[PDB]
Amino acid sequence: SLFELGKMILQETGKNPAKSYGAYGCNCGVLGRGKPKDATDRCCYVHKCCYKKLTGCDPKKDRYSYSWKDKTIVCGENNPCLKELCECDKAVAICLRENLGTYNKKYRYHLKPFCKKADPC
Amino acid sequence: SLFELGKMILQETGKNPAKSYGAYGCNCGVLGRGKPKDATDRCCYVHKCCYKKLTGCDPKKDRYSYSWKDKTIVCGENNPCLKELCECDKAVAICLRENLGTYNKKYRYHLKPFCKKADPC
Numbered sequence A, B: 001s002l003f004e005l006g007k008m009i010l011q012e013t014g015k016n017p018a019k020s021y022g023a024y025g026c027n028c029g030v031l032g033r034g035k036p037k038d039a040t041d042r043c044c045y046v047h048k049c050c051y052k053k054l055t056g057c058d059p060k061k062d063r064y065s066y067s068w069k070d071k072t073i074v075c076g077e078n079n080p081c082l083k084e085l086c087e088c089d090k091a092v093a094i095c096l097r098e099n100l101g102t103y104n105k106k107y108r109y110h111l112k113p114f115c116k117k118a119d120p121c
């Protein structure tokens, strides 16, 4: 769920997830995708594409188990959808961390209506 | 959709919707409801309760027509769900404006996991 995702983002990036990523660029936050503004945004694009594989679980609402081991996100439960979900979330958290170097506050509450239409995943 | 909702919030409050309300308190923003932190939050609680009446339209994704007339949000189309949706959104925008006086930045990215469970609507 968004709870695990936010926690993962906090764990990897050390940033308040909602503040830093709740509305960033064309892909981080609500609704769907848009042409990415930058690498951080592209993380979120990839992450929304990743969500497309999920069957039977709701990426926003459904909790799943993961733990922090050796300062790594370690997805737990074998429930195929929840595990895929967990891995999507882990990946975006890692990706956002990796791209902190180009994080741009100007995209924080980027006007999503002006985003260019996303390519198919 | 969130586009119309955000626009309404901007029109009424003059605030960047994502920044001011995208994650505020226990009810403004993602997921569901929680015991409101304050009046602004309660607007959002009421607004998520309002969404519960919607059948056949997606409150996040579905566009609808409204206009700004006499500095009032005026919901257009007769499609029953979309009109209800529009009115829910109009109401929360008005409500958020009305409660700007107690808007508290401390709730902006309130830790939603610690929210108390919402009462039934």
Ligand SMILES: *CC(=O)c1ccc(Br)cc1
Binding pocket: A021, A022, A023, A027, A028, A029, A030, A043, A044, A045, A047, A048, A092
């Ligand atoms: C999936 C992803 O990276 C994302 C980021 C922010 C919000 Br909000 C929702 C989803």
Ligand SMILES: *CC(=O)c1ccc(Br)cc1
Binding pocket: B021, B022, B023, B027, B028, B029, B030, B043, B044, B045, B047, B048, B092
């Ligand atoms: C419904 C409502 O007031 C609300 C506010 C912020 C976000 Br984000 C979603 C919905």
